[PDB]
Ligand binder design. Sequence first.
Ligand SMILES: N[C@@H](Cc1ccc(O)cc1)C(=O)O
Length: 309
Amino acid sequence: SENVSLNNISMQILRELLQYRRHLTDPVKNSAKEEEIIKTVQLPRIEYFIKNKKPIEFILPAFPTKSPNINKVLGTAPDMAERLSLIFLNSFCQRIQLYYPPGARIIICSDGHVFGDLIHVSDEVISQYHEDIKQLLHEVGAINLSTFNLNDDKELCEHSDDFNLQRQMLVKHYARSEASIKDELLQNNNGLQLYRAVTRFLYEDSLSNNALQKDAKQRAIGVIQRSWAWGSLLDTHFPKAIRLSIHPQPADSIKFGIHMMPTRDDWLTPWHGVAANVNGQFILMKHKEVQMMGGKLVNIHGKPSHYVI
Ligand SMILES: N[C@@H](Cc1ccc(O)cc1)C(=O)O
């Protein structure tokens, strides 16, 4: 039949995707069966666009702000690493054109203002990081990529520059109770490793250790609650869209975790890391770990984009 043509296009996309899967890396897992599970998960969602002959669309919540711990990151400004990440994502969507001419698009949805209170990063700073990452797209000429923001939603606070209200509304209409968040996370090793990892980044950013520890553990459920709010917001705004995630996801999840640079850390993101030229291949590493490597910093446009080794 003709499903043979359609099934062949959808699989090539899924296979390209899988090459950049972000996952909890654990050898006891039969990777083969994980993928066989994901085939069933995403192939139908992909074939939706193909049957319609519509360009395939992805949503990805990412790039909310640069981590304020200069132990991890070079600067508040977006660094080369997102540049390299942004440039990767856009070319991913051009490749698909080589099979499937409508192509693909990715709506990067910024989550910077949603949890901005709990990160101790100014709403002023956040807004500039956003404006800059829009800036990068045009410098990059990354057409297949566009941006989605809290301000865009009609249902969100009218106009802008009342984030505290915007956050309240978002929590009201789309969030869940931190009590229900803590309960849901415990069930899985999946949910457990989110909790732990979210807290480790919150603690690492904030440098009384027992105080700061219980503190990061509470902010974690907070930040996670805000993120799933933004998640249900997009979950309704772009329902049939394929759902990319910046975090490792289970093979059963609707969300498909994805990487954008080489790194041995599953959870590192461009905002938490600097870019390193090591063996003539860029890698996402932490600013501290790379200085102990005797890396030399290189500056472009009067700002420090990356280190070299
Ligand atoms: N979303 C980040 C958490 C984070 C985001 C922005 C920050 O400035 C700091 C922490 C993560 O993957 O862990």
